[PDB]
Amino acid sequence: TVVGAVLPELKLYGDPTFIVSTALATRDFQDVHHDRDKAVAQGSKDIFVNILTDTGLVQRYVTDWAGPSALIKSIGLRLGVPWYAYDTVTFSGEVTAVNDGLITVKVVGRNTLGDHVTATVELSM
């Protein structure tokens, strides 16, 4: 691949089943990802996607494009606006670096509230 190559888009609808099932599949039982009343009590609008799911989706997004042979070396997240129930995050990608067979991808996940997550991913072929 080349620097400046853009990954295919991926849009994900954050319905409650998605938010709850991903949080519990990452064994994250914090009430903010499945209990709306506790989320609201703690000052959030609704339940929201957890950080481990962010990591997993970023990983998925890059291997969706790179394919099965890709070896994920690192995933770096800068956390942004919340991904609340019924919001849609759009992942966009751009290759930023290629060197010694080590690829670096900048990933941004955007929803209605703005930039939900910014990610730097390092991988092999």
Q: Which residues, in sequence order, are CB contacts of 109 under 8 Å at separation 6+?
A: 54, 57, 58, 80, 83, 89, 90, 91, 115, 116, 117, 118, 119
Q: How far is the CB of 110 from a second copy (least distance, A)?
A: 24
Q: Rounded distance, CA 29 to CA 8, Å?
A: 32
Residue from the set 28, 36, 56, 80 that interacts with a second copy by CB under 8 A: 36
Residue from the set 9, 11, 41, 60 that interacts with other proteins by CB under 8 A: 60
Q: Rounded distance, CA 5 to CA 12, Å?
A: 22
Q: Which stretch binds a second copy (CB under 8 A): 6-14, 31-39, 76-84, 101-109?
A: 31-39
Choose among other proteins, a second copy, none what residue 40 binds, the Cβ cut-off being 5 to 8 Å by kind. none
Choose among a second copy, other proteins, none what residue 71 binds, the Cβ cut-off being 5 to 8 Å by kind. other proteins
Which residue type is seen at 110?
A: R
Is the CB of 38 or the CB of 106 nearer to a second copy?
A: 38
